[PDB]
Amino acid sequence: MMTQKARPVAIVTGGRRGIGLGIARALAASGFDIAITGIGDAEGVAPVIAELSGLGARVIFLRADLADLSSHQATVDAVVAEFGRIDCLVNNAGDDFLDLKPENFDTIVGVNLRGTVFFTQAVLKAMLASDARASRSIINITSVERLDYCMSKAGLAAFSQGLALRLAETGIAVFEVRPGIIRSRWGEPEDIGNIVAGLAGGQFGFATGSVIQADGGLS
Amino acid sequence: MTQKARPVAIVTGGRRGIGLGIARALAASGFDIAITGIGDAEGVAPVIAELSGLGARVIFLRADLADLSSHQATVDAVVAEFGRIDCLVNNADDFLDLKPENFDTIVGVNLRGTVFFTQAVLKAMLASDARASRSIINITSVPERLDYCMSKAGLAAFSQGLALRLAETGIAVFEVRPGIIRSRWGEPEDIGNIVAGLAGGQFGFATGSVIQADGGLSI
Amino acid sequence: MMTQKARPVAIVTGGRRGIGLGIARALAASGFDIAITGIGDAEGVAPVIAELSGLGARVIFLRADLADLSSHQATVDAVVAEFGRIDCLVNNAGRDDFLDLKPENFDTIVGVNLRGTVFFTQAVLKAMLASDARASRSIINITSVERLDYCMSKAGLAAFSQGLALRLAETGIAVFEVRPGIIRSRWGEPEDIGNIVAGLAGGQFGFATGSVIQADGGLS
Amino acid sequence: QKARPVAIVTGGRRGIGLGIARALAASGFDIAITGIGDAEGVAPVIAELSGLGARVIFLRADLADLSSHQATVDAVVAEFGRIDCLVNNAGIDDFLDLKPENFDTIVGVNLRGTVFFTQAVLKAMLASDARASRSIINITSVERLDYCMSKAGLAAFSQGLALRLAETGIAVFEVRPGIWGEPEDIGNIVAGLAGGQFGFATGSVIQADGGLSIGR
């Protein structure tokens, strides 16, 4: 109590609802300030900011389409402008094969996955600037039949592995979390939240590269 | 006594290097060969001739498989020549510096090419209806650039998912991961042997298998 | 607002030195009482006991050779007698070219030491299941991440972890595997592994049973 | 006629083991079959595989009994002069009720049996020195904890041997059956691997369940 500690800062993409919101709650409750990104309207966001604020966090919502690469820098900058630092990124993602259309592959692999890879780059750059050099994390939420989804998921898994190795010397740990089936018995968003809050809280600094199953063992 | 058809293989990029290795091994073991590529009249002639000598009927098809609209003509050409397809062989930096264009090229476009060319061949395999033993053999590899790692993981996930979806047809799906090859190393002949082996029929029941092909250096 | 309860109990096998002590320290600091087992004489453990007490923990040491199956029940009973509960088990335990490998060796490692971990866990699990509020509990197996018998035993332990996790998924008992890299007596510290185990043991990871945690600072 | 490569098929008397011996005989191998039981029902099998071109012998041996190993290898070398292929096929409910005796039998003795039989065969393989393509093929499976442990031990043994034997010409594969499968289906895979075309794929694991590995 002599010395005041910063609330570390977490970006939770798609943190407005579902697993994302389960994650923002757990992080808020465990001492993080929160920046949520999404395309959702103001009325959707308002009670989430109010609730999360209740748990003692300062919370912002950034309305931006992460699929669009030209929105990344502005989004990163709006976070740094609010809090002056970034400690944790949570990349929270959200059929017969003969029917598969290139449109679907383009959307899911060409656009969505690309958006995650490059937002991560934009966030990473701001993290690597700071130099405070505390314990930071990049946590990628994937899951576990649409082959393009399988491919995206696999890509992100290799992304996390590769990133973890590249960042091994830096104090930024990289993790993958694979949620199973979650209701809105079965898993709750609080269960994923708890896992993400555990990984973000610093105790796993030496566990970079790890893959956490999050399906209550059902596999 | 019943005459069996020489089974038909499409070896993509079969003109040089590893593809040629595979194309030879399959020829030598009773396959007719269709090779795809981009190269001029010159780079084609003694290859068709060498493979003809080994006992095969051989056609070359000029195709940039990255271009999706060229798929249907390519398949149609193979079907028009032999009347059936038995085997598809799908053959062939610091993160802060990674560029969206890089991703577009490798994940965005080349992986997409492989997936949808596979889809086109699949449709033609399935229509013929003989229902005999067919194979799709995906050739991959084993600090690298994170977009190649992602496409490689995409491809691997694609093999697994096809295997499962094709499990009740006579089409087996395999993944071959070659190590290091020549221009105590590995030959293109070595890869060929594995592929000839997998395509020869003895592996019908081994669908979903990943074959390491580095003479055990990966361990 | 903030609610403090009685302390859960952790058994840390081999918790007297090295990785085990780093684990016990972190468990103590994170709110657990501790039972340390060791094959060795109870001599020289007093400092550790006094240290972990400085971290708020009641701590006992129990002499036990876990390879000896007949010693299991007594050890488990002694922990229950001291604390009235067990919430966390931390299984923390321990050269040739293959043509020269000997049956005696395979037996020692595979034959006994791995048999030890398996059945000791079985004995703890009975004690855990005999009083369960289906409460938040965990079993954490510490392995590693070249000689063939150790590799096999590693593999066995990984398989054990998976299977036990599946089997225990109905209960509140999560099972994890933690694969340390090389650690100091660069490399990591026993504290890096302790933090991970303390993390797994704290409750936040109940839905994550069956997870394998890399604990080598991502160098593999 | 050319010389015939020689394969040891442990548990080759019936089931999957017979499917492998049948298929290796047809691809040009002579065969030695190993079995815990008496040699009674064997004659038919010996007759069938001769039809396929193969000289075949049956060796009664309990591979769980290490002291029987040397004699078995010696018997195969005595008959045939060489050993080109070892197929490890011989093998055999609530954890709260698991008994140390059960563990000992499956893990501490039977898995031990395979590991050490392989050691003995490999000693014979490495003395021959012929060092053309050779193979050791470990047959496993695609719920009782000790079995899973045994199988995982075997997967890992498989991988280590593969790496240790990398520079030698002896390749090491694991095959994982799940049987609507037939012993022929497994036999073909094994004949493919024992056949040479996979020398550079040592260490590879083969799935053998017709793709019910993520299906049912």
Residue A157: name the closest of A118, A209, A204 by CA: A209
- Joined together, the tokens standing for residue D28 give 């040009």
Residue A57 has, within 13 A of its CA and on its CB side, a CA count of 26
Quickly list H helices, D27-95: 42-51, 69-80
Hey, is the C-beta of A194 within 8 angstroms of any chain C C-beta? yes
Contact between B6 and B31 under an 8 Å Cβ cutoff? The reply is yes
Contact between B92 and B18 under an 8 Å Cβ cutoff? The reply is yes
Q: Do A168 and C217 touch (CB under 8 A)?
A: yes
Nearest CA in chain C to A214: C208
Contact between A189 and A15 under an 8 Å Cβ cutoff? The reply is no
Residue D12: name the closest of D4, D27, D39, D28 by CA: D39
Would residue B65 show up in a list of annotated catalytic residues for this protein?
A: no
d(CA B59, CA D137): 38
Contacts of range D157-160, beta carbons closer than 8 Å, 24 or more positions apart: D157/C148, D157/C151, D157/C152, D157/D114, D157/D115, D157/D118, D158/D203, D158/D205, D159/B219, D159/C151, D159/D203, D160/C98, D160/C148, D160/C151
d(CA B178, CA B91): 11
The 10 Å Cβ neighbour count of residue B45 is 10
- Distance (Å) of CA A50 to CA A10, A43, A56: 17, 12, 10
Residue B201 has, within 13 A of its CA and on its CB side, a CA count of 8
Kind of pairing between the strands at C9-13 and B210-213: unpaired
A47-64 exposure pattern, b = at least 16 Cβ within 10 A, e = fewer: ebbeebeebebbbbbbeb
d(CA C20, CA C123): 20
- Distance (Å) of CA A55 to CA B94, B114, C123: 39, 49, 42
Write out the DSSP string of A154-193.
Answer: HHHHHHHHHHHHHHTTTTEEEEEEEE--B----B-HHHHH
What type of residue is D169?
A: G
- Joined together, the tokens standing for residue A156 give 């992100």
Burial class of residue D10 in the structure, from the number of CB atoms within 10 Å of its CB (0-12 exposed, 13-18 middle, 19+ buried): buried
Burial class of residue A133 in the structure, from the number of CB atoms within 10 Å of its CB (0-12 exposed, 13-18 middle, 19+ buried): exposed
- Joined together, the tokens standing for residue A159 give 């992304």
Minimal Cβ distance to B153: which of A100, A147, A155: A155
The 10 Å Cβ neighbour count of residue B16 is 16
Write out the DSSP string of A69-126.
Answer: GGGHHHHHHHHHHHHS---EEEEE----GGG--HHHHIIIIIIIIHHHHHHHHHHHHH
- Joined together, the tokens standing for residue D33 give 């079959």
Query: DSSP secondary-structure letter at D23?
Result: H
Q: Using CA of residue B23, residue B26, residue B29, residue B31, what is the dihedral sign?
A: negative
Hey, is the C-beta of B154 within 8 angstroms of any chain D C-beta? no
Q: Do B197 and D195 touch (CB under 8 A)?
A: yes
Nearest CA in chain D to C97: D164
d(CA D161, CA A218): 34
Contacts of D19 (CB under 8 A, 6+ apart): D182, D183, D184, D185, D186, D187
Minimal Cβ distance to D100: which of C69, C107, C163: C69
- Contact yes or no, D with B (3+ CB pairs under 8 Å): yes
The 10 Å Cβ neighbour count of residue D96 is 9
Chain B interface, best mutation among D136, D185, D204, by max B CB count within 10 A: D204
d(CA C196, CA C205): 11
D39-71 exposure pattern, b = at least 16 Cβ within 10 A, e = fewer: eeebeebbeebeebebbbbbbebebbebebbee
Burial class of residue B209 in the structure, from the number of CB atoms within 10 Å of its CB (0-12 exposed, 13-18 middle, 19+ buried): buried
- Joined together, the tokens standing for residue A29 give 């409750």
What type of residue is D150?
A: S
D164: left (phi over 0), alpha (psi -120 to 50) or beta: alpha
> Helices A72-83 & A114-130, crossing angle to 10 degrees?
40
What type of residue is C114?
A: L
Which among C120, C150, C160, C176 is annotated as catalytic? C150
d(CA B1, CA B37): 38
Q: Using CA of residue A24, residue A29, residue A34, residue A39, what is the dihedral sign?
A: positive
Query: DSSP secondary-structure letter at B5?
Result: P
C181-197 exposure pattern, b = at least 16 Cβ within 10 A, e = fewer: bebeeeebebbbbbbbb
Kind of pairing between the strands at D205-208 and B171-178: unpaired
Write out the DSSP string of chain C.
Answer: -----PPPEEEEETTTSHHHHHHHHHHHHTT-EEEEEESS-STT-HHHHHHHHHTT--EEEEE--TTSGGGHHHHHHHHHHHHS---EEEEE-----GGG--HHHHIIIIIIIHHHHHHHHHHHHHHHHTS--S-SEEEEEE-----HHHHHHHHHHHHHHHHHHHHHTTTTEEEEEEEE--B----B-HHHHHHHHHHHHTSTTGGGTT-EEEESSS--
The 10 Å Cβ neighbour count of residue D102 is 14
Q: Using CA of residue D80, residue D82, residue D87, residue D88, what is the dihedral sign?
A: positive
d(CA D103, CA D149): 9
Placement of tokens 């898995």 in the chain: D111
d(CA A91, CA B101): 22
Radius of gyration, alpha carbons of chain C: 17
Element (H, E) at B62: strand B58-62
Contact between D116 and D76 under an 8 Å Cβ cutoff? The reply is no
- Joined together, the tokens standing for residue D13 give 């008397």
End-to-end Cα, chain C, rounded Å: 44
Instruction: Give strand pairing partners of C36.
Output: C12, C61
Collapsed DSSP state (helix, strand, coil) of residue B219: coil
- Distance (Å) of CA C13 to CA C19, C35, C132, D93, D145: 10, 8, 22, 27, 22
Nearest CA in chain A to C171: A216
Contact between B189 and B24 under an 8 Å Cβ cutoff? The reply is yes
3-class SS string, C186-206: CCECHHHHHHHHHHHHCCCCH
Structure resolution, Å: 2.5
- Distance (Å) of CA C168 to CA A186, C140, D149: 15, 13, 17
d(CA D3, CA D170): 18
- ∠ CA B184-B188-B193 to the nearest 5 degrees? 100
d(CA A50, CA A135): 28
d(CA B128, CA B136): 16
Distance from CA of A12 to the nearest CA of B (A): 21
Residue B56: name the closest of B46, B44, B48 by CA: B48
Instruction: Give strand pairing partners of C37.
Output: C13, C62
Minimal Cβ distance to C115: which of D103, D161, D164: D103
Hey, is the C-beta of D124 within 8 angstroms of any chain C C-beta? no
Residue A196: name the closest of A21, A3, A46 by CA: A21
* Phi, psi angles (nearest 5°) of residue D100: -50, -35
Placement of tokens 């488990």 in the chain: C76
Placement of tokens 């993390």 in the chain: C199
Instruction: Give strand pairing partners of D136.
Output: D86, D172
Minimal Cβ distance to B219: which of D159, D191, D214: D159
Burial class of residue C79 in the structure, from the number of CB atoms within 10 Å of its CB (0-12 exposed, 13-18 middle, 19+ buried): buried
d(CA B136, CA B210): 12
* Phi, psi angles (nearest 5°) of residue B210: -110, 125
For residue D155, which residues of chain C lie inside 8 Å, CB to CB?
Answer: 155
**Residue D161, Cα to own-chain centre: how many angstroms?**
14
Q: Do C164 and D95 touch (CB under 8 A)?
A: yes
d(CA D178, CA A211): 28
Element (H, E) at A175: strand A172-179
All structural domains of chain D: 1-216 (3.40.50.720)
- Joined together, the tokens standing for residue C204 give 């936040």
d(CA C33, CA C178): 21
Query: DSSP secondary-structure letter at B110?
Result: I
Contact between A113 and A34 under an 8 Å Cβ cutoff? The reply is no
What type of residue is D70?
A: Q
d(CA C140, CA C129): 16
- Joined together, the tokens standing for residue A60 give 């912002």
The 10 Å Cβ neighbour count of residue C105 is 17
Element (H, E) at B188: helix B188-199
Residue B208 has, within 13 A of its CA and on its CB side, a CA count of 22
d(CA B71, CA B24): 24
Hey, is the C-beta of C140 within 8 angstroms of any chain A C-beta? no
Contact between B208 and B159 under an 8 Å Cβ cutoff? The reply is yes
Q: What is the largest CA-CA distance in chain A?
A: 65
d(CA D30, CA D183): 19
The 10 Å Cβ neighbour count of residue D212 is 18
d(CA B132, CA B62): 28
Q: What is the dihedral of CA D197, D200, D201, D202, to 10 degrees?
A: 110
d(CA B179, CA A151): 23
Contact between A214 and A178 under an 8 Å Cβ cutoff? The reply is yes
d(CA C40, CA C62): 9
> Helices C114-129 & C72-83, crossing angle to 10 degrees?
40
> Helices C148-168 & C114-129, crossing angle to 10 degrees?
20
Contact between D56 and D101 under an 8 Å Cβ cutoff? The reply is no
Collapsed DSSP state (helix, strand, coil) of residue A166: helix
Contacts of D207 (CB under 8 A, 6+ apart): B206, B207, B208, B209, D142, D176, D213
Instruction: Give strand pairing partners of B60.
Output: B35
d(CA A195, CA C60): 31
What type of residue is B168?
A: E
Contact between A37 and A64 under an 8 Å Cβ cutoff? The reply is yes
Residue A191: name the closest of A217, A172, A209, A173 by CA: A217
Minimal Cβ distance to D204: which of B187, B207, B211: B211
Q: How was this entry determined?
A: X-ray
- Joined together, the tokens standing for residue A70 give 């030209």
d(CA D40, CA B37): 61
C214: left (phi over 0), alpha (psi -120 to 50) or beta: beta
Contact between C56 and C24 under an 8 Å Cβ cutoff? The reply is no
Element (H, E) at D134: strand D134-139
- Distance (Å) of CA B40 to CA B22, B44, B65, D149: 21, 7, 16, 57
Collapsed DSSP state (helix, strand, coil) of residue A173: strand
For residue D124, which residues of chain C lie inside 8 Å, CB to CB?
Answer: none
Query: DSSP secondary-structure letter at D91?
Result: -
Residue C107: name the closest of C116, C99, C98, C97 by CA: C116
Collapsed DSSP state (helix, strand, coil) of residue D115: helix
Hey, is the C-beta of C159 within 8 angstroms of any chain D C-beta? yes
What type of residue is C205?
A: F
d(CA B27, CA C90): 58
